[PDB]
Amino acid sequence: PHRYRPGTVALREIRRYQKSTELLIRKLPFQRLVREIAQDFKTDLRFQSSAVMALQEASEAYLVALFEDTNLCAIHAKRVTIMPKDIQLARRIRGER
Amino acid sequence: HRYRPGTVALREIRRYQKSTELLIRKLPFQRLVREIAQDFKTDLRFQSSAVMALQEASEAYLVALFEDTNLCAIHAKRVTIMPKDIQLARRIRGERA
Amino acid sequence: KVLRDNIQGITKPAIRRLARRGGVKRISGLIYEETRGVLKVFLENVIRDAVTYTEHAKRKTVTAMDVVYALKRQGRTLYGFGG
Amino acid sequence: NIQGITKPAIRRLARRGGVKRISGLIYEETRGVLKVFLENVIRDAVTYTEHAKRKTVTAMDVVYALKRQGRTLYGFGG
Amino acid sequence: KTRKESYAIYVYKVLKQVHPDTGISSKAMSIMNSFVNDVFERIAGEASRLAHYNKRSTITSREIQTAVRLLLPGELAKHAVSEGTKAVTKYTSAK
Amino acid sequence: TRKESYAIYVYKVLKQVHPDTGISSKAMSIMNSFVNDVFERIAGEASRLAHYNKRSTITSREIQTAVRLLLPGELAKHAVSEGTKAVTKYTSA
Amino acid sequence: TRSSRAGLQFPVGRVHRLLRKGNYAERVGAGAPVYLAAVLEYLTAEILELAGNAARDNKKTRIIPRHLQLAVRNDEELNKLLGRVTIAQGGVLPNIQSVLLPK
Amino acid sequence: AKTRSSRAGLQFPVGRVHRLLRKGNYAERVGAGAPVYLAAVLEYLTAEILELAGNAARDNKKTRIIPRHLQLAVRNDEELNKLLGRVTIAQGGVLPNIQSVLLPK
DNA sequence: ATCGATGTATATATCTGACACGTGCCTGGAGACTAGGGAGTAATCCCCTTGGCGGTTAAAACGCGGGGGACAGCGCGTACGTGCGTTTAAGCGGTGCTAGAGCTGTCTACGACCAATTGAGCGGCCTCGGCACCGGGATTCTGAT
DNA sequence: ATCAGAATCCCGGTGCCGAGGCCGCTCAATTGGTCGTAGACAGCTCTAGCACCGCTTAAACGCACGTACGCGCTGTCCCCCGCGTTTTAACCGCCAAGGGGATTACTCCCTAGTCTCCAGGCACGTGTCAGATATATACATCGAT
C-alpha cells in the first residue's frame, strides 16, 4: 500500500485551495445557518440568493483571514497545530469581542 | 535590601497603570515631531496642543501595541516581549503586511 | 418550519478546507468547535445589521444590497454584489 | 531625534501596557514603530494644514488625521 | 472674539441631573464635547447613508432610530431607542 | 427602469489599457463596486475637508487633498498628477 | 423652546441646525433633531453616571479624564461603542496577566 | 467635443460624477473642476487595477479578467493592497502563500 | 540505490452559455442665460508660537551580579493526519405558487424660507473650595531565616 | 511559620488656580405664514423566493493505523533587572519678538436654477467563441524494498 506521510496531503490541499476560488462552505448548510441566525432577529424573513451568497463570501473571507492570523500565532508559539487559544488570541489582537 | 528580579517590574506596572502622566518626555517628543514634519513641509509651526495631541495618540497607540505584544509573548510561553512579538501583533492588527 | 442546531451544517471538513485555504497545515480537533462559534458571532453581527436595514426599508426580503451595506458598516467592505 | 524616545520611556510605556520583562531589541523595534506611526499621522495632519493654506499645524488637524486612521482622539474638541 | 460653540452647558445640566453633588473639569468637558460631536457625527452619517440607500431625500426620525440601532450595542441601543421614542412622542404631543 | 453603472466606462478603460482583453460580468460588478467605493471615499473626505475649513463648496483642491490623504504615496502622486492634468485640459478647452 | 417641549437637556435647535448645515440630507424632518438629541442626552447621561460612580469610588468630586476612561472601558457596552477611541489623559485599566504575577 | 469627458480627455463620465457629487449630499455647491478631477482620479485607479489584472490573466493565459485576476492584481501590488486592505472581493480567493516552517524539512 | 503507484498537467474534441456587438428608445446630460452668494484678497489686530537664559533637579545613562528566564535537547504518547468503505444529503433540475419587490398615480401634510423678536448661551471676570502637595505613622507587603 | 525593611496607603495642614457662578449682549432659535413637492398610501403587476420531488453522486463520516509533534522535563548560558553613582538636559519661570491665525470689508466671478434640445447609455436581442468538461496520456515525485 501507498500512504503519504503526515503533512504531505495537508500541503497539497493548502496549495489546491489557495489556487482555486470556489466556495468552501457547502451552500445549503450555510443558507440554513443564515436563516437560523436571522430567525432570532425578525421572523418570516426571506433572503435573495445573492444575499445568501454575499453572506457566504464574507464569512469565508473572514474565516480565511482568521485562520491566516491563527496560523501566524501558532507559528509564533513554535507550533504547527492551530489551537483554540491561537484563534482566541488572534481575535483579541484584531480587536474583536 | 535587594528586591527579587521581577518585583520592581510589577510595582512599576501598578504605578504606571494608575497614573495618567505622559511617559514620553515632552521636549524630546516635540523635537521628534518637528524632525518628522520637516520631511513633509519645511517651516512648519506646531500648536502646543497639537504636539500634545500627537503625544497622547502615540502613547495610546504604543500602550495598545505593548498590551498586544505582551499577550503574544505570554501566548508563546514567555514573559519577555521580543521583536517577533511586536511584529506578529502589528501583522495581525493589519499595519504590517 | 422551525430551525434548530444548523450550526453543525458547517462541517469539520468545511472548517478544515477554510483553514487549508488560509495556509493552516495542522488543525487541532478542538478548533472545529471554536471556529463555528466564531462564525456564528460573525453572522449575528452582519445579519443583525442587514435585518436592521431591511426593517427600515419596509421590506420583508433581505437583499444582497442590505448585506453589502452591513459589511461596509462593519469595516468589511464587499465587492461583487453591487455598490 | 528618534533617539529622544529613551530606553526608560519605552520601558514606562511597556509597563503601562502590562509588560513585565522587556528584551533588548524591543527598544529599537518600538522606536521604529513609533516613527512609522508618527510619519503617517503627521503626513495626514500636514496634508490637512496645507489644504487649509495654513503654516500652523493645529490640534484640530491632528485629531482629524487620527480620526481618518480609525484612531479617534477625545479631548481636543474633535 | 470668535464665538466658538460647544456642548458644555448641556453636559453640565445632564451631570447635575444624574449627580447633584459632583463636578467636572475642563479637560473632561472637552472629552464630553468631543464624544457628543463624535456620536452625533456617527448617527447623522449613518442616517444620511440610510436616506441615500432608500433613495429618500429626508432624514426623518426613523432614520435616526435605525442609525441608533445600528451603531449602539444591544442593551444600549434598546435604551437609546426607548428614550428617543419617548422624547419624540412627548414633543409631538405638545404644540 | 434605468440602473446606472460604470460598465461601458470600465470597458473603455480596459480597451485603452488592454486592447485584446475582456472582462467577466462578475468582474464588471467588482469594478463597478470599486469605482463607487473609491468615489464615496474621495467625496466624503473632501466633504469633511469642506466642513472643516467652513467652506460650502467642494472644488478641485478638496478633491486633490482627499486623493493625497486616502491614496498611498506613489499611487497618490500619480493620481494627483492625472487629476491636475485633466483639470488643466478641461480649463484650457 | 423645543428642548422644553420634549423634556430634553440637549438643544433640539442646535442639533437641527447642525443636521441642516452638516449636509447630511437635503431636508431634515422635524422629528429627527428631537430623537437625535434624546439619544445623545441618554448616551452622555450614561457616560457621566458611570464617571460619577467611578469618581465617588475614587473619592473625588470632579470628573477627570481618568474617570471617563474608567467608565468607558469598565462597561462592556460602552467599551464596545468607543472601542477605537483614545481618551486623552485617560490612562489605562489596571490589569496584570495571571502568569506575570509571582508564584 | 460636446461631452465634458471629451473636453477633459477622460473616459469616465464627468457629468455623471458631477450629478453624484451634487445629488449625493457632500456639499452645498460643487465646483466645476471637482467632477473632472474626481473622474480623472477614478480613471487612473481603474486603469492601474486593470493593467495588473490583464497582466495576471495573461500569466494564466486567459483573455477574460475574472474575480481571481482582480484579486491577484489588488493583493500583489503593495500600494494597491494598502488601499484595499479591508476589502473582500467575491470569488477573489487568496494569494498562494505557505509559511516556511510548514514546508517539509 | 531502481522501481512502482498516485497525483498533476496537458493535448484535444465538444459543447455551451456568457459576452461582445446591433438597434431603439428616452432620460439624463449639454448649452445659454440670470442672479445671487460665496470665496478670493488687502488691512488690521493681536494671539500664540518660536526663541533665548539660568537654576535646581528629576531622570537618563552607565556599570555589575546574578538570578531568573529563554532556548535547545530529549523522551513520551496521543491525537491528529491519511486512508477506505459507508452512508449522508448536497447539488442539479423540472414544475408550481404566490408573497412581495418594484413601478406608478395622487394629494396631502410636512418641510424649506423668509421676516421679527427675544432670550440661551457664549465670553469675560471674579471667588473660594477641591485637589495638588508634603511630612509622620500604619501597614502591607517582600525578602531572607 | 517567622524576623526585619522599604513602599505605599492614610491623614492632617496648607495653598492655589481653575471650576462654578454672575453680568452683558449678541445672534441664532422661536413663532407665524405661504409655497412646493416627498412621499405615504392605494393599485397593478410580474420577478423571483419558496416549496417540492426525484435521480446522481460528491462529500461527510466513523473507524483502523501510526507516527510526528505538543508538552513536560532538564540542563545551560546569558542577558535584563535592580541598584547605586555620575551625568545631562528636561522643566519651569520669565521676558522678547514677530509670524501668522483670524476677523472685517469689499468685490468679482463661479455656480445653482431653469428651460430646451438630443445623444450617450441602458435594456433587449442574437450570434459566437473563451472556457468548462470528460476522457486518455506523458511526466514528477514520494515512498516501500
JSON list of N, CA, C and O in Angstrom, two decimals, chain E residues 1 7 11 17 19 23 27 30 36-37 40 49-50 55-56 61 67 72-73 78-79 83 90 92 94:
[
{"chain": "E", "resi": 1, "resn": "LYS", "atom": "N", "xyz": [-13.49, 88.64, 18.90]},
{"chain": "E", "resi": 1, "resn": "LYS", "atom": "CA", "xyz": [-13.52, 87.36, 19.60]},
{"chain": "E", "resi": 1, "resn": "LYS", "atom": "C", "xyz": [-14.50, 86.39, 18.95]},
{"chain": "E", "resi": 1, "resn": "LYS", "atom": "O", "xyz": [-15.71, 86.62, 18.96]},
{"chain": "E", "resi": 7, "resn": "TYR", "atom": "N", "xyz": [-20.92, 71.87, 23.63]},
{"chain": "E", "resi": 7, "resn": "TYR", "atom": "CA", "xyz": [-21.98, 71.30, 24.44]},
{"chain": "E", "resi": 7, "resn": "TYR", "atom": "C", "xyz": [-21.70, 71.38, 25.93]},
{"chain": "E", "resi": 7, "resn": "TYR", "atom": "O", "xyz": [-22.13, 70.49, 26.67]},
{"chain": "E", "resi": 11, "resn": "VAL", "atom": "N", "xyz": [-23.94, 69.37, 28.88]},
{"chain": "E", "resi": 11, "resn": "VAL", "atom": "CA", "xyz": [-23.30, 68.29, 29.62]},
{"chain": "E", "resi": 11, "resn": "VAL", "atom": "C", "xyz": [-23.33, 68.58, 31.11]},
{"chain": "E", "resi": 11, "resn": "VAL", "atom": "O", "xyz": [-23.54, 67.69, 31.94]},
{"chain": "E", "resi": 17, "resn": "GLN", "atom": "N", "xyz": [-28.07, 66.67, 36.75]},
{"chain": "E", "resi": 17, "resn": "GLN", "atom": "CA", "xyz": [-29.26, 65.84, 36.83]},
{"chain": "E", "resi": 17, "resn": "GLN", "atom": "C", "xyz": [-28.96, 64.43, 37.32]},
{"chain": "E", "resi": 17, "resn": "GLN", "atom": "O", "xyz": [-29.77, 63.85, 38.06]},
{"chain": "E", "resi": 19, "resn": "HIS", "atom": "N", "xyz": [-25.98, 63.47, 38.86]},
{"chain": "E", "resi": 19, "resn": "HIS", "atom": "CA", "xyz": [-25.09, 63.51, 40.01]},
{"chain": "E", "resi": 19, "resn": "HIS", "atom": "C", "xyz": [-25.08, 64.92, 40.59]},
{"chain": "E", "resi": 19, "resn": "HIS", "atom": "O", "xyz": [-24.30, 65.78, 40.17]},
{"chain": "E", "resi": 23, "resn": "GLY", "atom": "N", "xyz": [-18.89, 67.46, 40.38]},
{"chain": "E", "resi": 23, "resn": "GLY", "atom": "CA", "xyz": [-18.43, 68.42, 39.40]},
{"chain": "E", "resi": 23, "resn": "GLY", "atom": "C", "xyz": [-17.69, 67.74, 38.26]},
{"chain": "E", "resi": 23, "resn": "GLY", "atom": "O", "xyz": [-17.60, 66.51, 38.18]},
{"chain": "E", "resi": 27, "resn": "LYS", "atom": "N", "xyz": [-10.92, 69.65, 31.24]},
{"chain": "E", "resi": 27, "resn": "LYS", "atom": "CA", "xyz": [-10.38, 68.58, 30.41]},
{"chain": "E", "resi": 27, "resn": "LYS", "atom": "C", "xyz": [-11.43, 67.51, 30.14]},
{"chain": "E", "resi": 27, "resn": "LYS", "atom": "O", "xyz": [-11.51, 66.97, 29.04]},
{"chain": "E", "resi": 30, "resn": "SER", "atom": "N", "xyz": [-13.95, 68.91, 27.65]},
{"chain": "E", "resi": 30, "resn": "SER", "atom": "CA", "xyz": [-13.51, 68.73, 26.26]},
{"chain": "E", "resi": 30, "resn": "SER", "atom": "C", "xyz": [-13.77, 67.31, 25.78]},
{"chain": "E", "resi": 30, "resn": "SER", "atom": "O", "xyz": [-14.18, 67.10, 24.64]},
{"chain": "E", "resi": 36, "resn": "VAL", "atom": "N", "xyz": [-19.75, 63.85, 22.33]},
{"chain": "E", "resi": 36, "resn": "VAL", "atom": "CA", "xyz": [-21.07, 64.22, 21.81]},
{"chain": "E", "resi": 36, "resn": "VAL", "atom": "C", "xyz": [-20.97, 64.52, 20.32]},
{"chain": "E", "resi": 36, "resn": "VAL", "atom": "O", "xyz": [-21.80, 64.08, 19.52]},
{"chain": "E", "resi": 37, "resn": "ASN", "atom": "N", "xyz": [-19.95, 65.28, 19.92]},
{"chain": "E", "resi": 37, "resn": "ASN", "atom": "CA", "xyz": [-19.77, 65.57, 18.50]},
{"chain": "E", "resi": 37, "resn": "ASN", "atom": "C", "xyz": [-19.52, 64.30, 17.70]},
{"chain": "E", "resi": 37, "resn": "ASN", "atom": "O", "xyz": [-20.04, 64.15, 16.59]},
{"chain": "E", "resi": 40, "resn": "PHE", "atom": "N", "xyz": [-22.76, 62.26, 17.50]},
{"chain": "E", "resi": 40, "resn": "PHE", "atom": "CA", "xyz": [-23.64, 62.98, 16.59]},
{"chain": "E", "resi": 40, "resn": "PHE", "atom": "C", "xyz": [-23.22, 62.75, 15.14]},
{"chain": "E", "resi": 40, "resn": "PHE", "atom": "O", "xyz": [-24.07, 62.49, 14.28]},
{"chain": "E", "resi": 49, "resn": "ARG", "atom": "N", "xyz": [-26.67, 57.91, 5.21]},
{"chain": "E", "resi": 49, "resn": "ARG", "atom": "CA", "xyz": [-26.45, 56.77, 4.33]},
{"chain": "E", "resi": 49, "resn": "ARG", "atom": "C", "xyz": [-27.73, 55.96, 4.14]},
{"chain": "E", "resi": 49, "resn": "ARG", "atom": "O", "xyz": [-27.99, 55.47, 3.04]},
{"chain": "E", "resi": 50, "resn": "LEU", "atom": "N", "xyz": [-28.54, 55.83, 5.19]},
{"chain": "E", "resi": 50, "resn": "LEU", "atom": "CA", "xyz": [-29.85, 55.21, 5.04]},
{"chain": "E", "resi": 50, "resn": "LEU", "atom": "C", "xyz": [-30.75, 55.99, 4.08]},
{"chain": "E", "resi": 50, "resn": "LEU", "atom": "O", "xyz": [-31.44, 55.41, 3.24]},
{"chain": "E", "resi": 55, "resn": "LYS", "atom": "N", "xyz": [-33.10, 55.94, -1.30]},
{"chain": "E", "resi": 55, "resn": "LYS", "atom": "CA", "xyz": [-33.35, 56.93, -2.35]},
{"chain": "E", "resi": 55, "resn": "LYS", "atom": "C", "xyz": [-34.39, 57.94, -1.88]},
{"chain": "E", "resi": 55, "resn": "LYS", "atom": "O", "xyz": [-35.25, 58.40, -2.63]},
{"chain": "E", "resi": 56, "resn": "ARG", "atom": "N", "xyz": [-34.30, 58.29, -0.60]},
{"chain": "E", "resi": 56, "resn": "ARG", "atom": "CA", "xyz": [-35.20, 59.24, 0.02]},
{"chain": "E", "resi": 56, "resn": "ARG", "atom": "C", "xyz": [-34.40, 60.46, 0.45]},
{"chain": "E", "resi": 56, "resn": "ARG", "atom": "O", "xyz": [-33.28, 60.35, 0.95]},
{"chain": "E", "resi": 61, "resn": "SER", "atom": "N", "xyz": [-37.10, 60.90, 11.68]},
{"chain": "E", "resi": 61, "resn": "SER", "atom": "CA", "xyz": [-36.82, 60.25, 12.96]},
{"chain": "E", "resi": 61, "resn": "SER", "atom": "C", "xyz": [-36.56, 58.76, 12.79]},
{"chain": "E", "resi": 61, "resn": "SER", "atom": "O", "xyz": [-35.82, 58.17, 13.59]},
{"chain": "E", "resi": 67, "resn": "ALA", "atom": "N", "xyz": [-30.28, 54.26, 12.71]},
{"chain": "E", "resi": 67, "resn": "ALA", "atom": "CA", "xyz": [-28.85, 54.53, 12.91]},
{"chain": "E", "resi": 67, "resn": "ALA", "atom": "C", "xyz": [-28.45, 54.23, 14.34]},
{"chain": "E", "resi": 67, "resn": "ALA", "atom": "O", "xyz": [-27.38, 53.66, 14.60]},
{"chain": "E", "resi": 72, "resn": "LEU", "atom": "N", "xyz": [-25.28, 51.38, 18.14]},
{"chain": "E", "resi": 72, "resn": "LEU", "atom": "CA", "xyz": [-25.13, 51.14, 19.56]},
{"chain": "E", "resi": 72, "resn": "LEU", "atom": "C", "xyz": [-25.32, 49.66, 19.89]},
{"chain": "E", "resi": 72, "resn": "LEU", "atom": "O", "xyz": [-26.10, 48.97, 19.23]},
{"chain": "E", "resi": 73, "resn": "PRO", "atom": "N", "xyz": [-24.60, 49.15, 20.89]},
{"chain": "E", "resi": 73, "resn": "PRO", "atom": "CA", "xyz": [-24.74, 47.74, 21.28]},
{"chain": "E", "resi": 73, "resn": "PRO", "atom": "C", "xyz": [-26.14, 47.45, 21.82]},
{"chain": "E", "resi": 73, "resn": "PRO", "atom": "O", "xyz": [-26.87, 48.37, 22.20]},
{"chain": "E", "resi": 78, "resn": "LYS", "atom": "N", "xyz": [-31.18, 49.49, 22.73]},
{"chain": "E", "resi": 78, "resn": "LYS", "atom": "CA", "xyz": [-32.55, 49.36, 23.23]},
{"chain": "E", "resi": 78, "resn": "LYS", "atom": "C", "xyz": [-32.94, 50.57, 24.08]},
{"chain": "E", "resi": 78, "resn": "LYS", "atom": "O", "xyz": [-33.99, 51.19, 23.87]},
{"chain": "E", "resi": 79, "resn": "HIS", "atom": "N", "xyz": [-32.09, 50.92, 25.05]},
{"chain": "E", "resi": 79, "resn": "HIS", "atom": "CA", "xyz": [-32.39, 52.04, 25.93]},
{"chain": "E", "resi": 79, "resn": "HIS", "atom": "C", "xyz": [-32.45, 53.35, 25.15]},
{"chain": "E", "resi": 79, "resn": "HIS", "atom": "O", "xyz": [-33.34, 54.19, 25.39]},
{"chain": "E", "resi": 83, "resn": "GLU", "atom": "N", "xyz": [-35.68, 55.83, 24.79]},
{"chain": "E", "resi": 83, "resn": "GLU", "atom": "CA", "xyz": [-35.59, 57.23, 25.18]},
{"chain": "E", "resi": 83, "resn": "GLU", "atom": "C", "xyz": [-35.96, 58.15, 24.02]},
{"chain": "E", "resi": 83, "resn": "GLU", "atom": "O", "xyz": [-36.70, 59.12, 24.21]},
{"chain": "E", "resi": 90, "resn": "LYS", "atom": "N", "xyz": [-43.37, 62.78, 23.22]},
{"chain": "E", "resi": 90, "resn": "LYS", "atom": "CA", "xyz": [-43.63, 63.92, 24.10]},
{"chain": "E", "resi": 90, "resn": "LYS", "atom": "C", "xyz": [-43.58, 65.24, 23.34]},
{"chain": "E", "resi": 90, "resn": "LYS", "atom": "O", "xyz": [-44.42, 66.12, 23.56]},
{"chain": "E", "resi": 92, "resn": "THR", "atom": "N", "xyz": [-44.15, 65.64, 20.10]},
{"chain": "E", "resi": 92, "resn": "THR", "atom": "CA", "xyz": [-45.30, 65.65, 19.21]},
{"chain": "E", "resi": 92, "resn": "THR", "atom": "C", "xyz": [-46.60, 65.99, 19.93]},
{"chain": "E", "resi": 92, "resn": "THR", "atom": "O", "xyz": [-47.41, 66.74, 19.38]},
{"chain": "E", "resi": 94, "resn": "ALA", "atom": "N", "xyz": [-47.04, 67.93, 22.55]},
{"chain": "E", "resi": 94, "resn": "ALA", "atom": "CA", "xyz": [-47.04, 69.37, 22.72]},
{"chain": "E", "resi": 94, "resn": "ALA", "atom": "C", "xyz": [-47.02, 70.06, 21.35]},
{"chain": "E", "resi": 94, "resn": "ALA", "atom": "O", "xyz": [-46.57, 69.50, 20.35]}
]
